[PDB]
Amino acid sequence: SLEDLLFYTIAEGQEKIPVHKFITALKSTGLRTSDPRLKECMDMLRLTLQTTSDGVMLDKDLFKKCVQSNIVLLTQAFRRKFVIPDFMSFTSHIDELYESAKKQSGGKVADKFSPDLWGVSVCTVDGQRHSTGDTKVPFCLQSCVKPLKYAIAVNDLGTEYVHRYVGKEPSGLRFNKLFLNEDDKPHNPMVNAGAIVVTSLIKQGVNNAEKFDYVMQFLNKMAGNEYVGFSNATFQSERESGDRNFAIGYYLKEKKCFPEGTDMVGILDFYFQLCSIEVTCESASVMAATLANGGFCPITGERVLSPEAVRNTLSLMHSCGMYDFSGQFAFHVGLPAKSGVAGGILLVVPNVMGMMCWSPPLDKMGNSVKGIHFCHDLVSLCNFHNYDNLRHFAKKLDPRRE
Amino acid sequence: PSLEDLLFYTIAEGQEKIPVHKFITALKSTGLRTSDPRLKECMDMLRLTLQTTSDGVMLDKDLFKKCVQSNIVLLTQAFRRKFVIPDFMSFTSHIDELYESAKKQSGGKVADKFSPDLWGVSVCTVDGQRHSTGDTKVPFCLQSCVKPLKYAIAVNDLGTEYVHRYVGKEPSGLRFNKLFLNEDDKPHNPMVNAGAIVVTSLIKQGVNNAEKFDYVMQFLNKMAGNEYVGFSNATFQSERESGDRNFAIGYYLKEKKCFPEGTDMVGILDFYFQLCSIEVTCESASVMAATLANGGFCPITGERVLSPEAVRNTLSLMHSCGMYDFSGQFAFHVGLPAKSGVAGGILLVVPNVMGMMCWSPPLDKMGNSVKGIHFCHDLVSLCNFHNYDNLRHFAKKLDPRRE
Amino acid sequence: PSLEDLLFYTIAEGQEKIPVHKFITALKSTGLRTSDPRLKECMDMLRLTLQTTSDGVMLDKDLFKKCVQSNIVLLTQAFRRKFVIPDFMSFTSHIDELYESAKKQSGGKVADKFSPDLWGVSVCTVDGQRHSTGDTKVPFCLQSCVKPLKYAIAVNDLGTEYVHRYVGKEPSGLRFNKLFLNEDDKPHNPMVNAGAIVVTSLIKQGVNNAEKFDYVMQFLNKMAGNEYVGFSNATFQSERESGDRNFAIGYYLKEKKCFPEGTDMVGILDFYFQLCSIEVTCESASVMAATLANGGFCPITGERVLSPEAVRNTLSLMHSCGMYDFSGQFAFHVGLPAKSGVAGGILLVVPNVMGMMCWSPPLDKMGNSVKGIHFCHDLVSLCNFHNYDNLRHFAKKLDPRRE
Amino acid sequence: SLEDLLFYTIAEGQEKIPVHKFITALKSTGLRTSDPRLKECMDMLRLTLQTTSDGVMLDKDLFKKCVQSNIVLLTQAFRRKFVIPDFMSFTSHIDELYESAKKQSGGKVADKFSPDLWGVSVCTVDGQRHSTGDTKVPFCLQSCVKPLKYAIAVNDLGTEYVHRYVGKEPSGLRFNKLFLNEDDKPHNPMVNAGAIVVTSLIKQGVNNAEKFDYVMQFLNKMAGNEYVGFSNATFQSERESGDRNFAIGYYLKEKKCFPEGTDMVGILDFYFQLCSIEVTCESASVMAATLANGGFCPITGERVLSPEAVRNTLSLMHSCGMYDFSGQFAFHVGLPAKSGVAGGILLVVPNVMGMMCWSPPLDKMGNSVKGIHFCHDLVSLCNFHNYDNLRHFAKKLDPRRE
Ligand SMILES: O=C(Cc1ccccc1)Nc1nnc(CCSCCc2nnc(NC(=O)Cc3ccccc3)s2)s1
Ligand SMILES: O=C(Cc1ccccc1)Nc1nnc(CCSCCc2nnc(NC(=O)Cc3ccccc3)s2)s1
Same domain, C182 and C141: yes
Three-state DSSP class for C281? strand
Same domain, B372 and B274: yes
Q: Chain D: nearest CA to C15, how far in angstroms?
A: 38
For chain C, the first-to-last Cα distance in angstroms comes to 28
Three-state DSSP class for C121? strand
Breaks (C-N over 2.5 A) in chain B follow: 112
Cα(A181) to ligand 1 centroid in Å equals: 9
Nearest CA to ligand 1 atom 35: A177
Cβ neighbors of C313 (< 8 A, separation 6 or more) are: C151, C152, C155, C160, C169, D331
- The amino acid present at D364, given as its one-letter code, is K
Q: Which of C49, C81, C113 is the last residue before a domain boundary? A: C81
Same domain, D55 and D117: no
Which residues of B lie inside 8 Å of A (Cβ-Cβ)? 126, 169-176, 182-183, 294-297, 304, 308, 311-313, 315-317, 319-320, 328-329, 331-332, 335, 337, 351-352, 386-395
Three-state DSSP class for A335? coil
Cβ neighbors of B237 (< 8 A, separation 6 or more) are: none
Contacts of C252 in chain A (CB under 8 A): 243-244, 247, 251
What is the spatial distance between Cα D393 and Cα D388, in angstroms, rounded to a whole number? 6
Same domain, A68 and A138: no
Q: Tell me which residue of A269, A271, A267, A289 sits closest to A279, measured CA to CA.
A: A289
* Chain mean position to CA C400: 20
What is the spatial distance between Cα D257 and Cα C49, in angstroms, rounded to a whole number? 75
Cβ neighbors of C206 (< 8 A, separation 6 or more) are: none
Three-state DSSP class for C297? strand
Q: Is A180 in the pocket of ligand 1 (CB under 6 A)?
A: yes
What is the spatial distance between Cα C219 and Cα C19, in angstroms, rounded to a whole number? 41
Same domain, C194 and C290: yes
Residues in chain A: 402
Q: Find out whether A337 and A375 touch, Cβ atoms under 8 Å.
A: yes
Q: Tell me which residue of D354, A314, D44 sits closest to B386, measured CA to CA.
A: A314
* Alpha-carbon torsion, ordered C36, C41, C47, C50, to 10 deg: -130
What is the spatial distance between Cα B100 and Cα D366, in angstroms, rounded to a whole number? 60
Distances (CA, A) of D320 to B29, B138, B185: 71, 53, 26
* Alpha-carbon torsion, ordered A93, A95, A101, A105, to 10 deg: -160
Hey, of A179, A238, A243, A262, which one would you mutate to test binding to chain C, going by the most C CBs within 10 A of its CB? A243
Same domain, B94 and B134: yes
Q: Chain B: nearest CA to D255, how far in angstroms?
A: 9
Q: Which of D50, D80, D110 is the last residue before a domain boundary? A: D80
User: Beta-strand (E) ranges in B135-234?
Assistant: 140-141, 229-231
Q: Tell me which residue of A193, A239, A226 sits closest to A298, measured CA to CA.
A: A226
| Total domains, chain D | 2
Q: Is C248 in the pocket of ligand 1 (CB under 6 A)?
A: no
Rg of chain C on CA atoms, in Å = 23
Q: Find out whether B140 and B362 touch, Cβ atoms under 8 Å.
A: no
Give DSSP secondary structure letters for D107-158.
Answer: -B------TT--EEEEEETT--EEEEESTTS-EE-GGGHHHHHHHHHHHHH-
Q: Tell me which residue of B334, B341, B288 sits closest to B314, measured CA to CA.
A: B288
> How would you class B263 by CB atoms within 10 Å of its CB: exposed for 0-12, middle for 13-18, buried for 19 or more?
middle
Angle at CA of residue B335, ends B330 and B339, nearest 5°: 60
What is the spatial distance between Cα A339 and Cα A317, in angstroms, rounded to a whole number? 9
Closest residue of D to C392, CA-based? D294
- Strand B229-231 relative to strand B278-280: parallel, antiparallel, unpaired? antiparallel
Report the 10 Å Cβ neighbour count for B50. 16
- Strand A277-279 relative to strand D277-279: parallel, antiparallel, unpaired? unpaired
What residues are paired with C230 via a beta bridge? C279
Side-chain half-sphere CA neighbours of D163 within 13 A: 20
* Chain mean position to CA C399: 21
Side-chain half-sphere CA neighbours of B42 within 13 A: 23
Q: Chain B: nearest CA to D174, how far in angstroms?
A: 12
Q: Find out whether B350 and B366 touch, Cβ atoms under 8 Å.
A: no
> How would you class C400 by CB atoms within 10 Å of its CB: exposed for 0-12, middle for 13-18, buried for 19 or more?
buried
Q: Tell me which residue of D376, D335, D393, D383 sits closest to C307, measured CA to CA.
A: D393
Closest residue of C to A175, CA-based? C179
Domain ranges, residue C329: 82-403
- Helix, strand and coil content of chain A, in percent to the nearest 5, comes to 50, 10, 45
Cβ neighbors of D155 (< 8 A, separation 6 or more) are: D295, D304, D305, D306, D308, D309
Same domain, A41 and A89: no
Same domain, C110 and C72: no
What is the spatial distance between Cα A251 and Cα D207, in angstroms, rounded to a whole number? 57
Q: Find out whether D299 and D232 touch, Cβ atoms under 8 Å.
A: no
Three-state DSSP class for D142? helix
- The amino acid present at B138, given as its one-letter code, is V
Three-state DSSP class for D132? strand
DSSP label of C159? -
Same domain, A111 and A72: no
Contacts of D173 in chain C (CB under 8 A): 170, 173, 182-183
Angle at CA of residue B297, ends B293 and B299, nearest 5°: 70
User: Beta-strand (E) ranges in D255-385?
Assistant: 277-279, 348-349, 353-358
Q: Which of A49, A80, A111 is the last residue before a domain boundary? A: A80
Same domain, B297 and B330: yes
What is the spatial distance between Cα D67 and Cα D44, in angstroms, rounded to a whole number? 9
CB contacts < 8 A, A to C, total 33
Q: Tell me which residue of B137, B170, B115 sits closest to B322, measured CA to CA.
A: B170
Contacts of C389 in chain D (CB under 8 A): 307, 311
Q: Tell me which residue of A270, A244, A154, A234 sits closest to A192, measured CA to CA.
A: A244
For chain D, the first-to-last Cα distance in angstroms comes to 27
Q: Tell me which residue of D208, D299, D212, D196 sits closest to D252, measured CA to CA.
A: D196
Q: Is A257 in the pocket of ligand 1 (CB under 6 A)?
A: no
Same domain, D276 and D293: yes
Q: Is A179 in the pocket of ligand 1 (CB under 6 A)?
A: yes
Inspect the interface and report whether the beta carbons of B332 and A169 lie closer than 8 Å.
yes
- Resolution, rounded to a tenth of an Å? 3.0
Report the 10 Å Cβ neighbour count for B44. 12
Same domain, D238 and D93: yes
Cα(D180) to ligand 2 centroid in Å equals: 9
